[model samples]
Target chain A: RQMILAVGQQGPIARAETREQVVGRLLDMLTNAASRGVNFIVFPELALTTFFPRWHFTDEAELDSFYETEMPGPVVRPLFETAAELGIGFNLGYAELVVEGGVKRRFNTSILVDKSGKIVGKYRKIHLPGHKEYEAYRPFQHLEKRYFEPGDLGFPVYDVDAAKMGMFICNDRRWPETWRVMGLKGAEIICGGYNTPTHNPPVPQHDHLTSFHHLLSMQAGSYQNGAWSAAAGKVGMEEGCMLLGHSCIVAPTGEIVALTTTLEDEVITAALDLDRCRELREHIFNFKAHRQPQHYGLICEF
Target chain B: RQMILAVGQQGPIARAETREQVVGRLLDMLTNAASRGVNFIVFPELALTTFFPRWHFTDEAELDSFYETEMPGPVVRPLFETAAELGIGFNLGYAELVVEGGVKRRFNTSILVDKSGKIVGKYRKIHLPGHKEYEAYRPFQHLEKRYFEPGDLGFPVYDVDAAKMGMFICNDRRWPETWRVMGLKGAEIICGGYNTPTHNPPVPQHDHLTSFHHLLSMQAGSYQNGAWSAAAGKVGMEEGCMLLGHSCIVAPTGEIVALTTTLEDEVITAALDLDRCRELREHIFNFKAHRQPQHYGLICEF
Candidate 1:
């Protein structure tokens, strides 16, 4: 009797928000997901404020506060308190500046919290893409490498509320390994948060291919992994910056179970039986007995 | 430096004959390969004789002779002798009937040999498509399921002459698992022979897809697996059955490096640098580093 999961593909929350502003946007989406009777809802990556704060950072001095001083700090505390009050659960992505084992680590990450508001699983993105230095002649801007260090943690699946869950960030979604590693870890559900630009065209003219490639890559991952993947986006044109608006939930068999139809903030939900995956395992597509890992290793080596 | 490889897509030679007739065709192809200075040559499945007595039979006596008692028997001894004399290597596909545990076993299989006439590797087809019962309405005939049991041997690779090689039979070329497994095995080259009907016009929607689908499927597989692939075929109208021609060689990057221009009986040659496979493997394309077999399993199971 588990309920449907909701993903909010929201319009731009904009940059440099004084905590209160960003929380308001999340609260609105949470309210929508709650009204739909969704057991869980996921938020887009770095949804707190601005499209790319990394662009504004001239040095490390200004980068610290841009990332959350504390995850459930003043801004996100209400989200936790509200979900607990509503008896619902959620996972969200954000920029966190934290000290782990005496090391100053800057991470682009996500957290999973239960219906009772306790942190259950934390995942730091592993694959980081984009050029490190700033590009002067781009349509918009790319600041991933300039702003954050590559993730030190690889993908990890978490046991939560009677299910196995995995998480990844935007660029991580494009690579097959990201899904493959999580699939290997036995994840039944994978959630990825993104801030993808619709206008970010690939070189040599594949501009119109942005959204198609985005969905194609995710669909292929979902089909191959046999896991439900929820991709949420912080979308829309802000200051003339257009983020690809199509955020979706994919079934284990790679079908699009649910999705946002437009660029504005909207809560989309889909029912998943969860056990259909096991039936898939016994079929001709079984990966355990049939797949040879040794061969894949040789392919990489050759 | 190695010259180009002239692969012979040996169509099934099934008119039950002594090994003599089968070896003659092998010699013909071998002589042509040597005259063209080919480093390696290949033949279609069960190329030794007429697509042996394709029929629906319940009795054991009917199936016995079609299977080769031993490779390089009297019919094939000359092929080995000739290959050695010419200093050229070749691959032969056939129906193998062997005694195991005092019981008889039959399989549709292929073999790879080095230039010095030593057997390098063997492959048993994993996917055995077509109905076991005879279909009278179809333009031609399909007796695979009736004649051969599903292959028990899984897809495997062999390291020979400093190159990693993989093999597949007619219908096996159409499945993704075939190449995926080989890629995982670290296969540098994938070789397959097919006898495909040129017309699938009953389904007009897929009219152009005959060759497009065939080529695209292998191309996609080669790029994803990061291996070079050669799909040679026995093409042209035989009796009244038209077989699709357009055998091709694909690079690990999915480019068509070489292709046969016509469907008539002809030998096309292409030179492939094994180093290119090495370069593709070194790139992030390696599935072991990126693919999650567990995810595929979970999807199947769930």
Candidate 2:
């Protein structure tokens, strides 16, 4: 049986906005997706707040304010409650501050929730892009390296009803190894969240190709790995930084099944058959029969 | 500062045609490319003969007739001599029969020749597609598995005066590892050749998407590895099988700089700056600084 999946492309959220305001906006999107028979809905990276990595903040308190100390905090509890009540699952991206080994660590994290409002899976962003120290010569800064530590958790997949689902953050989608790892884990669908700025400070000439590159990566990842891929983007101008919109869902054949047109808050849904993965995996991409692991040793070599 | 590279997309050669007729056609394409100031030119797989693998040949002599005993054999010497005369380097794919250690082996091989007409490097197709045992239920057969052995040569790169170049044959281009291994070798340009039939027996529905998938794989490989990639195709109908055409040259940023519009024998040239690879490799896709090879162990796992 095929599952109806929806990807939510939300606009920017200001720094001053409360958690209630974020959940309220999500509830409207959730209700609209549920009406369209969507079994699962996915949101973009940093969905609850602005893309804070665009600036360098020296104050520790300011950085902490951007993170959520807990997954379902009091303000965000309503979102979970509504999703459970509507009998729809969801995947959401956010800033996570956790305590591990008596030390505090922050990660660009994402969570997968079941229809019963239970957390089924969690993933931390592995491939983080941008410079660590700030460069003042540029128009703006991309300080992701200074903000979050590298993800400790490797690529993991979970069973989400009919699909073996996996998650990756924005930069992780650009690497082919990311998808191949999940494919090895027998993942049928990969849901990713991204918040890419429309303008590349280093190569401004490539700004026009951002949208093309975005869809190209997603489509290629889908076809090569024989998996359905859905990517949601945090769009619109956030804190004077423009984000690339056009969130989409790609089938195993590398064709765009559904795509969002506007930069504003919008939901696009598509029915994906899990059997498609098996059809190709058992034939053209039969890993065990076709893959040469001995020759690929160089890929993992330092 | 930059190299003018040309990809020659050739039409089909019937099995009845002689080698002189084939070299005559290639000479026309080469002279045209040289007139356009092309420094390097790449021709499709099995350039000197028809795609002989489509037919299932049980007799050893019939299959032996299709293999080249020498790199620059009696028929292909003209191509090398002509390339040296024009001061243009070229990459050519062909079926090779070699004797090593008192054993005879056949391989789907590609050779890289410098402007001085010297064979600098060679590569064997690692990922051989299709089943060795013939399935007569289809309209036509793809007998690559029955005739050629899996390539013994690992992905290798060679210095071509201005840039390091790597070569891969038809099916090898579909795998990401094919490009990644070459990228690790500091290859600046990836030259590939293909002869893909238009119809897939199992899934006729994907007949139209084959061309799109071909270009998508090349573009994604170029962008992710920050290298200039060029692919040439053997187009038009050959022995009742039709091939897809749109051969192209992709820049480091995954943009198609030049593309051939027709399926007939034609050459498309573009000026590629090797510095573009350094600019993006050192910044966006710095393999040493950014690639997390430790986490990619699953890629080599069975």
Candidate 3:
């Protein structure tokens, strides 16, 4: 099966950019990808607002303002309507806020919207990066742990027409299990979104390799799992913090078929042959014949 | 906490070559690495013999001749003695045969020998690639499954003075669980060897991507797990089967610090800062604080 895929990389959403304004930019990219004949498109993490985790917010009102009380809320409803009109399916990353057992819960979340404008898949961010508390030693704060709880939903896959799709968010792409679980579920395409800062407070020496690390993870994750990868990034500087930009689409062969060069609103698409995965799965990585769970006793212990 | 490491890549070993002749070549590589101040070195898998798995052997006597009944057999004793003389530690992969419960047990194994010439660690190959029963359809037969049993020993780690080390055979590098298990054990450096064929029988279409896949796996395995990876390969056309050649030393940052360019006997070394792992382990890949094993329930189930 062949499907044309695209990654919609956003430059940045200003601190004051409202949800409606941000959705408009997403709509523009969605329309562009459709014009290019893309069957599916992926958007960046926290595409609805600025990266609020970069700073500490003591006021509850400010923190809650960044989250959506419900998906497809009034301000973000245009995204779903526009995608369906263009006959395109999409994966979107955003802040999720919910109330269960009368307790407030927040998560870094992403959802797969089918061409019919229905939610087909959902995932909370696992493998949260940065510290929970504020540390003044670094240039800025990365308070993901303090702001959102680890994803309760596992790496879930959904059937979006011809593609068996999976989703991950921001820091989730750095972990192998995020991709392995999806691969085990027989996912053909893994769509992910990231807002990676160029500077790492603990290891600023790696500031220059931020983009390399971005492609490296996807390429390896894609090839090792025998699946196609669609990764979109929120790039450039937003509120004085610089983010990584080299978003791209990697094939099962581990080759970057398409990539975005400029740190701006960009759309890159490629013809992804779903049958290509058979080369690795049926032979090299025939998981059923090669995977030895008995010997891998320790992989689950930790 | 800096340790200099080396990878010794071997050229094609003719079927007529003897074990003693191979040991002499290994001794030369060892002495050369020691002369350059390398504390540890990794040699390719099945370094002592030609790539014999290409042909299926019906004669049990011939198959048994390739395995080592004792690790320090008369033919291989010179290797241990030479490493001790050079005061350098090393890892070597070979076919292992041991009698257990009066039954002949065979394994694709690798062992770690410290500077003092003591066998410090051992690991049987877990992720064996290719098929077991021979098929006359393709050019050659990769009959690993027909010859050796699955590894009984799990991924093990050893402390060789200043550095914590782990070992894997050729195909183990392709699996993430191999690195994850070692990473969980606090291994600073993971040493491995491969005899990867450039052309795959089932998927000749992936012949060009053989080298790319080799580097991709090591680069991602090292960076994602916060470990320095030293990989050596037996390259060139052995028994008319082409093997992959770009063996190298990968840093925790996912950059290839040193690499072998030719399909011949070559040695390359790199200064591996064991403490460099902290940049990832302590921050980006801090497994203790960040790994979400709960959502990864399926990783172990397989």
Q: Per-residue lDDT tens digits of candidate 2, residues A1-302?
A: 68999998888888687778888888899989978889999998988888888878988888888899998999889989988898788899999998888688989999999888889999998888888788888777888877888788889999886679999899899888898899889889999789998888877877888898898889888888899989999898877788899899999888999999888889999998999886568777888767787888889986
Between prediction 2 and prediction 3, the one with superior DockQ is: 3
Model 3, residue A105: C-alpha shift (Å): 0.9
Lowest summed lDDT window (length 10), candidate 1 chain B: B293-302
lDDT of 2 by residue, B101-207 (tens): 99889899888888888888898888888878889788888888887888998998899877899888887787888888998898899997899888989778788
| TM-score for candidate 3 (chain B) | 0.98
Candidate 1: Cα lDDT at A193:
79
Task: Name the lDDT value of residue B101 in candidate 1.
Answer: 100
* Model no. 2, DockQ: 0.74
Worst 10 residues of 3 chain B by lDDT: B293-302
Range of the 10 consecutive residues with the lowest summed lDDT in candidate 3 chain A: A293-302
Clashing pairs in 3: none
Q: Per-residue alpha-carbon lDDT of model 1 for B1-302, expressed as tens digits?
A: 23466667544343455568657766777787777868877666666655542355667776676778898787678888888878787668788987899977778888888878898778876666555677776545566766777677677788757678888887766445567667777888888777776654223334454675567556656766678788777666555556677777777666777777776545667787776765445533534343444324422231
lDDT of 3 by residue, B88-172 (tens): 8899999999998999998999999888888998999888777788888989899888888888879999998688999988989
Clashes of 1: 30
Model 2, B210: alpha-carbon shift in Å? Answer: 1.5
**Residue B78 shift from truth in candidate 1, angstroms:** 14
Candidate 3 ranges beyond 4 A from true positions: none
Please give, as one word, the docking class of candidate 1. incorrect
